[PDB]
Nucleic acid binder design. Structure first.
Lengths: 112, 218, 62, 211
RNA sequence: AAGGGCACCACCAGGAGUGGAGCCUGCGGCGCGCGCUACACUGACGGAGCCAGCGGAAACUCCGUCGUGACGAGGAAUUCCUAGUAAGCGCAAGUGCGUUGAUUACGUCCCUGCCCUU
C-alpha cells in the first residue's frame, strides 16, 4: 500500500489517498440484478444496491483487479494497483473494474 | 499473429459458441462418439436422444469456422458447449481432423482427458474448462443468440456499431432442431440472419463473412 | 443522468420477498413530498444515500 | 421458387461446379475414401468428403433457397452430374455414399413420386448445359484476389456466373482451363473448397439483395 | 388447508476446498476416502536483522545477487464453514502449542426440510 500511494502520486501529484477514494467512489454499481424465479429459464430482475455493498464490492473489484489483473507479467502489485486505482479514479475504460461496473449496469437497464 | 485465448480479456474479436453440441462417448470394450448413424438402432430402443446425437453438426461447424479467413487472421475464437453441459475452448491454430471418423477419435480422447496437447508444445489445442462461459469471455463483449424467429440483421451493419474496444460473442445451436433459448441467461438479444432457416454451419459462414467484410479481411 | 438521491424512512418489518432483496419506503430528498417503494440488494438500515435512476418503478413482491 | 435446370438457358443464375470431385466406387459397392481405403492404397484422389462438405455448404445457402443457384459436379475421371437445387442431400457422409454409389450405377436418382430427377449424370462438356450469357471463372489461390460483391455487380443484367472450384485437397488450378475466361482468388489465405463456396455464395447473396 | 417458528445436510451473500497427476496410506472389489510431493520475481539464492508458547523456531524484515530463459493450476459433480476464527507457519509431546492473521455471515422464510399451534 505504502509503495502504491507513492507510485500514484508520482503519476499525478494529488493525494493518492484522494485517488484511492475516487476509484472506490466511481466504481460501485447503481443497479445490480437479482436471480428472479423466471419459471425455469430464469430472468434477472433490475435491485438497487446498498452503500455498504457499493464500498465493499468496489474494494473487492480493484484488488482482484490488481492481483489477477497483472499476473504473468513484468510488474509489481504496488504498480498494478496504482494502475487499477488511477484508471478507476478518472474513468477511461482502462480499468477492469470500470469495465465490469458498466457491464453489470448495462445489464440492469435491460431488466427494466 | 498472436493466438487468442480466454486469458486475453481486452482484444476486440469475434467469438462463436457452438451451444447445445452433441458430444457423448459410447462404450460398446472400446469408445466412440454417440452418433445417429451407428446408434440410431440403440437410441430408438431406449426411446430418446432422437437427434440428440448429431456430433457431425459440431464437426461441420468447426471446419467451417477455423477454415475461415477471420480465423486465419486471428480475430476469432470458438467455444463448445455440450448438451450435457461440458464447455470446451478451441485453440484457433488447431488443424481439426478433416473426417468425422478421425474427429470422433479425438473428441472421445478430449472428453476422457479434458485436454489435447501438442506433441512438442505445452499449450493445449482443446481444453475442457469451467462454466460459465461468461468468466472466460472478454470484459467488453456483446452477446447475441442466432435465431430464426428473431429480427433479421445485416451482419456487416450489426458489427460496425460495436465500440472500438468491444468484442462480439455469438451463440449458435449446434443441433438439428430446438428452442433457441440455450443461452437466454447470457445474451443481450437474439438475431436472425436470413428469412430462410439456416444450418449451424451456414449461420457460421454467414457471420464470419460478415465480420470479414466489416473488419476488412480478405 | 438525472440521478436522484433518496433517504430511507422505513425498512419494512413484515414483508414477503425472495431472499436477499428487501423493499424500502424512501423519502425523496429533493422534495419531501414524494415517497416511493423500492427494492434494495445489500443490507440496509435507515438514514442513508440512495442512488436512483428510474424514478417511479412501483415494484412489488419479487 | 421455380426450379433451375440446364434447359433454362436464359435466367440469370449462379452456378458452382465442383471439379476433380472424388467419386470413385470401390468393389467389395461403396465410395472410395481415405478413412476406409487408406490402407488399400495415393490418398488425394479419394476425398469425396470434400464434395459432400460443399454440397451441404451449397444447398443450404440462402441463394439456393432463393433458387438462383445451380450445382454441377465434375469428377476427376470426367463424369458429369447435374444436381437439382431442391434435393435435400443426406446430412451424413455414410448416407451420402450409399446414395452417391447408387447414382453412379443407375445414372440418376429419381424422386419416389415426382418425375423430376434429384441427381443426374449428364454428358460432357459442361458448356452445353450452361446459360448462353454466362461468365466462366476458376477459383485459384494463385490469382488476383477480388471482392465477390464488386465482381457480381459488373455482370450484365442477363449474364449468369459460373465458378469452377476444386473439390480436392491439393493441386493445379488447371482443371477448367479449357473453359474459363479468367482465374481469380477470393482470399489472401488459402481456403478449403467449402469455405471458398461460402465466400462466393455470400458475396453474391449480398450483391443480389438476398435475403 | 391456516398461523407461527428453526436450519448453510435451506435460501440469501463469500472463503477454503474436494472431485485432476505421481506416490503414501486405509476401505471395497478381485471403484472410493485421508494424505505427501508438485507444476517461481508477492520468487530463489547470499549476507545481515532477529521474535514464541505448550513441553536466538520458521514464515518474516532489511541489504544484495539472479532477470524470464505423470504433472503447464485440475470435468460433471461435490464438502465444511462466522474471530485471534479460516488459511498460512513452524515447534514440543506420543495430540497439543504458540507466531502471522483475514475476506464473508450475524439476515430471511422465496425454495427444500423439520418443529409448533390451528
Amino acid at each position: 500500500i505504502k509503495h502504491t500511494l507513492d507510485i500514484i502520486n508520482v503519476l499525478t501529484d494529488q493525494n493518492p489517498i484522494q485517488v484511492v477514494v475516487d476509484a472506490i467512489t466511481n466504481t460501485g454499481p447503481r443497479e445490480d440484478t437479482t436471480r428472479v424465479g423466471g419459471g425455469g429459464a430464469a430472468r434477472r430482475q433490475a435491485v438497487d444496491v446498498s452503500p455498504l455493498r457499493r464500498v465493499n464490492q468496489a474494494i473487492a473489484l480493484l484488488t482482484i483487479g490488481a492481483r489477477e489483473a497483472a499476473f504473468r507479467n513484468i510488474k509489481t502489485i504496488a504498480e498494478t494497483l496504482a494502475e487499477e486505482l488511477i484508471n478507476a479514479a478518472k474513468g477511461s475504460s482502462t480499468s477492469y473494474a470500470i469495465k465490469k461496473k458498466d457491464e453489470l449496469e448495462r445489464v440492469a437497464k435491460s431488466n427494466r | 499473429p498472436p493466438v487468442l485465448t480466454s486469458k486475453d480479456k481486452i482484444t476486440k474479436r469475434m467469438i462463436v459458441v457452438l451451444a447445445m453440441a452433441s458430444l457423448e462417448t459410447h462404450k460398446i470394450d472400446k469408445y466412440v462418439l454417440l452418433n445417429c448413424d451407428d446408434h440410431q438402432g440403440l437410441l430408438k430402443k431406449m426411446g430418446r436422444d432422437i437427434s440428440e446425437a448429431r456430433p457431425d453438426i459440431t464437426h461441420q461447424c468447426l471446419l467451417t469456422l477455423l477454415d475461415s479467413p477471420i480465423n486465419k487472421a486471428g480475430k476469432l475464437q470458438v467455444y463448445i458447449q455440450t448438451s450435457r453441459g461440458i464447455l470446451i475452448e478451441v485453440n484457433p491454430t488447431v488443424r481439426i481432423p478433416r473426417t468425422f471418423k478421425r474427429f470422433s477419435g479425438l473428441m472421445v480422447q478430449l472428453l476422457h482427458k479434458l485436454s489435447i496437447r501438442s506433441v512438442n508444445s505445452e499449450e493445449k489445442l482443446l481444453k475442457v474448462i469451467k462454466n460459465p462461459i461468461t468468466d472466460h469471455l472478454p470484459t467488453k463483449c456483446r452477446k447475441v443468440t442466432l435465431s430464426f424467429d428473431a429480427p433479421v440483421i445485416r451482419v456487416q451493419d450489426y458489427i460496425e456499431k460495436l465500440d472500438d474496444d468491444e468484442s462480439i460473442c455469438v451463440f449458435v445451436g449446434a443441433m438439428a432442431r430446438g428452442k433457441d433459448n440455450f443461452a437466454d441467461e447470457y445474451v443481450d438479444e437474439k438475431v436472425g440472419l436470413s428469412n430462410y432457416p439456416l444450418s449451424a454451419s451456414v449461420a457460421c459462414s454467414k457471420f464470419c463473412h460478415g465480420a470479414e467484410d466489416a473488419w476488412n479481411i480478405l | 443522468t438525472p440521478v436522484t438521491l433518496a433517504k430511507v424512512i422505513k425498512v419494512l418489518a413484515r414483508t414477503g420477498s425472495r431472499g436477499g432483496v428487501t423493499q424500502v419506503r424512501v423519502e425523496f430528498l429533493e422534495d419531501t413530498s414524494r415517497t416511493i417503494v423500492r427494492n434494495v440488494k445489500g443490507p440496509v438500515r435507515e438514514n442513508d444515500i440512495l442512488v436512483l435512476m428510474e424514478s417511479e418503478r412501483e415494484a412489488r413482491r419479487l
